[PDB]
Symmetry: C3
């Protein structure tokens, strides 16, 4: 009993809200608008600023995490590398945002040694997540070192919550992984953006549901319907098992698809233990006939035993048919909320409208500034002789630009462009190029103003780039929806 500091009412409330919000944000459930944890966001943005894209070969992950420590995220090195390892595995994570280089793990449960042993880089999907970031797309903030700037939320181009899910730590509130097939997800985005009232049955027509990174069988469409209506629910995960009867008589259970985030080795040891716990018999042996390649494993049922009985009993006991809860809890508008499939996609469509409007306004700013400078040079091309007469009558550059701005109503940018205009550009062979490019840039300004004026074309650009992503990446369901 050392500190005896008493008068701590509102200060314990403020410090408690601060430490709770720091838990919820930093080491807990991620955002709606990109589905990415802040550790993950700083991973992607730091590896963007290092430029470690798939044009270059893989770089040492220790340098990337050291730049994360020195710029964006001052926390555990092994925790940042844990996020690195979990992101860069095909079974741990559906679409590997980071493509790694070296031993990371196995489905049996394995870990890499440290951040200085293996390499990594961004995959083809992180370039999607970071395409059009540097263009006033999402507002930056100053981080803990007050010299670096980080993005608040990564400007996504595909809604990554439905793709990769949110694993959650409860300090009262935890959250789950509904994974999804990318192409059906994008089609669901299209149908929601077309009709503002689509029933969730008509999106279950679109979306089957859990597209696992290793495949499985999903039992229960009722729990699926409950989940994409209310947010809370549970489905059942039955492995892809089949009964194959030999001509000899000793039947066969071929198991090929253990469910989401379930060990192989622990389940097979649990099966052998349940043989030697002797509650039920009939299992002859287990053949684990692969080292790393191909997931198809034979467990034998003896002669004179219907293997569907053994199959139902291993589904009852083991981690081969489990429950799996859905609770789609994430940050919207700064608060954690349980949100539905409708609400996730409504918010994502609103965010892509924000992304498109900000990118379009940025390019209109850039082209408008260039057209402003080119208009100043065009006014210089209008009355060349008066400009030359003032330059010959000038004494300093400031006098020349001030008298040009006084005489032809010019800007500082315009007058600097005139006083830095090259004399070789004083020809009709150059006035043609300037005038044609000026009309082209005003045409581009009119096009971007038409984009900013009509929200239909906003949705059109969204549809086009989403279908581009769907062409570039969309596989189909490794998991079969059974009944």
């Amino acid at each position: 009993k050392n500190l005896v500091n008493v008068n701590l009412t509102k200060e314990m409330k403020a410090s408690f809200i601060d430490y709770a919000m720091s838990v919820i944000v930093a080491r807990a459930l991620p955002d709606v608008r990109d589905g990415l944890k802040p550790v993950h966001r700083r991973i992607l943005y730091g590896m963007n600023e290092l430029g470690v894209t798939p044009d270059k070969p893989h770089k040492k992950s220790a340098r990337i995490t050291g730049d994360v420590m020195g710029k964006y995220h001052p926390h555990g090195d092994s925790s940042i590398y844990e996020a690195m390892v979990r992101m860069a595995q095909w079974w741990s994570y559906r679409y590997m945002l980071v493509d790694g280089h070296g031993n990371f793990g196995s489905m049996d449960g394995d870990s890499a040694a440290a951040q200085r042993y293996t390499e990594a880089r961004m995959s083809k999907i992180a370039l999607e997540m970071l395409r059009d970031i540097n263009k006033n797309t999402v507002d930056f903030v100053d981080n803990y070192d007050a010299n670096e700037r980080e993005p608040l939320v990564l400007p996504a181009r595909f809604p990554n919550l439905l793709v990769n899910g949110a694993t959650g730590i409860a300090v009262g509130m935890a959250t789950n992984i509904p994974p999804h097939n990318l192409g059906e997800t994008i089609d669901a985005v299209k149908l929601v953006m077309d009709n503002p009232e689509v029933t969730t049955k008509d999106l279950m027509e679109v979306l089957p549901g859990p597209d696992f990174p290793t495949g499985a069988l999903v039992m229960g469409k009722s729990g699926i319907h409950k989940a994409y209506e209310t947010g809370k629910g549970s489905i059942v995960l039955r492995s892809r098992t089949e009964i194959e009867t030999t001509k000899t008589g000793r039947e066969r259970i071929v198991v090929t698809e253990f469910p989401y985030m379930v060990n192989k080795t622990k389940v097979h040891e649990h099966i052998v233990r349940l043989v030697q716990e002797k509650r039920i018999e009939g299992i002859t042996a287990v053949r684990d006939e692969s080292n790393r390649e191909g997931v198809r494993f034979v467990i034998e049922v003896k002669r004179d035993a219907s293997a569907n009985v053994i199959l139902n009993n291993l589904f009852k006991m083991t981690q081969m048919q489990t429950n799996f809860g859905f609770n789609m809890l994430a940050i919207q508008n700064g608060i954690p909320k349980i949100l539905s499939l409708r609400q996730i996609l409504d918010a994502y469509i609103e965010h892509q409208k924000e992304v498109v409007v900000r990118r379009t306004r940025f390019d209109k700013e850039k082209a408008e500034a260039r057209a402003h400078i080119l208009e100043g040079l065009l006014i210089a091309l209008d009355h060349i002789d008066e400009v030359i007469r003032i330059i010959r009558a000038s004494e300093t550059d400031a006098e020349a630009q001030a008298e040009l701005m006084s005489k032809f109503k010019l800007s500082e940018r315009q007058s600097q462009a005139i006083l830095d205009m090259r004399l070789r550009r004083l020809t009709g062979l150059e006035r043609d190029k300037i005038q044609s490019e000026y009309d082209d840039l005003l045409a581009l300004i009119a096009d971007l103003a038409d984009i900013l004026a009509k929200p239909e074309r906003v949705s059109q650009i969204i549809k086009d780039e989403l279908d581009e992503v769907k062409r570039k990446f969309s596989d189909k369901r490794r998991t079969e929806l059974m009944v």
Copy 2:
């Protein structure tokens, strides 16, 4: 300052209550009704389900803790093994529930290396703690993997709070160890269950107080009386020291019983340091004349120095006579409360009444179902010819059992027993055995109904099994209550 999640009033209250209750339950003060921590409860129940009893030799503790991790308690492996080591030491813990096998520690303060170096099993007292568990005795719950079931509270057969105590971590609220002699405790339980108003002076007539695992001297019966009245108090722990005067002249302090959870080595180094801190003199030397066997240690006082002065001064300074607080704080009805010796034993007697009523109702269910089946076979033995006439007139087994249930008002269990009754059992040599066993089972049902009807016999069964435990285990006080 990363997460900026604002609207968190009731969610920070719910998450804060959740994390606080998870601290209080999991890593903090244990229960009234069995005195066992949830880590300890999962240790005992996992080692029960593995069957690692003293009929078998000791098994590797790593496998037990791995089964704890895979079934009941997903937390620190070294923390679970710390509970394993602390439970399985005679000086660290009064009655070793786990009997170990290998190097665990010393009273000097020593630790085992890991969970995969040494072995363990249950001792003779954990079989008491787990006797009659599988018989609807305490309701199970589903744990974090939703396939395993764990017990809420272990059905105790001796009140383990008073025996082993509760060490407590304060997040505002900590709790202490009153240990007790088992036989006097059981006699106190008997006298409380006999007279519902026994004064606490009359139970201090029964209970002396702290029965330490290594022995000591307890000063202060006033603090003892304060403790078993109100819960809060403190007693004084003076070591078993004696002054032995040599014929030569250089006197002797024989110290044999350091108090509860006090190091030997730190106290002897503190004594040598107090000699070389030179506040008071007269100590010649310290002889630590044992390696591991026998706790009797001689510290010499020189010629011309009364060793009672040195003895009072080492009691003033060192950790040889210390204070020791009592604050009997534990979970009753789901809340933590400071409870008295009366209240602990009233609650324990209520829990054993619950245990006895549930076990008696379970055995009445089992014998009643068997008597129901045997009554169906007895009705089959009544009119055998009509049953045979319907079986000969039957076409399917479902038809046969339906017509038997229609004709003689039978059950599905009764009709299956009749249609599976062996024809060799159709004799008067077999009707005698069935009728005699049927009357015996109805006699057992009448006996269990008499147990469920009269709470006197409930207390009688409690007295009998407690006195059985008292015969099987009760030693006496290694600690002397001095004045």
Copy 3:
């Protein structure tokens, strides 16, 4: 979900206040009245009770931290040794309270191995911090082992907040380091204690501001004025850099003083990376021309590049000119408060008044007890014959002292001094010494009563001992206040 303990309203409030106050005190922001963390306070007091002063050579730090663990502070050994290492470095800490012995670290960022490899002791400033501690100066408390006593707040002799600063961990509330030059600080204390209303501009006349342990340049006197008025503010830290033009042409940036708690190696690697990040060019190379001795480092700017442009750009980008916040938050009266420079020094002057009054009352107690005993012996010297007549008429010592106290109105201390008075002291050659020493001790009592009666002399003693400290230690600013 293991513990299900519900009724926890006021108990979660009490446990939450307890764990929050334990964070704030133990592992967080330190006190006003000595500027020392409780870990640091237990370091200094434990090394005081071990007596490891600079009269003896350095002792092994593992023994000191082990005595800290065994007496005052039961927490992380590496955390206590982290406080040991940070305190005993000239660049990590302004005036090294602990003087160490061995490898501790570097400005590049280095750590010692453990507490058992290197040695330490108190420096010349910890003897100042612990001078007049054992004299009823600050009230002790009983610590966690109830046998040791520790000081609440160390009786400081120079205000250590302004000297060494308070680094803070936010659980909502963090705090910063304003370091100060000792001599100007003491002069500010003198001027505040003289005039109770000195304007903060007139103390910025006294106090320049941040006296860093390695030197720097401070930009912004406005933020300084904001800081010592309100507490919150920020100043800018520009390194001591200079542009030196070679006769060849390739200019030179000599950097000698990186700011407070900024790495060298990370900044030079950041500069080389910014060369290879290729945002701006002109830097030729970096020469790190020292191993450990002398901090003067040359970074080259190429021919035809004004190095003030490169200098402003490295100030914009790197950690060479940074921001630095001031938020003087510390414990006053048991609560954390943001306090101003006026308020820190008003509270420090009040604390030194408390120190002086308590020390003066202690020495008045000691001299008054000695004068009481000497007055009893003086009354014995008055009527020697009656005392001898009663001693000759006595039978026991208790009778003799009781009859002396009855006959001459004496005390137990006085009568024991008379009955233990040596007969050789019954001479006029000894009555002279007793009478002269008695008048001298009554003169000392009158002097201390004059100190306790007039607060002017209290401030005078404070001024004298502060100027003694200023003579013994005060260097000048390694940091230049630039504009």
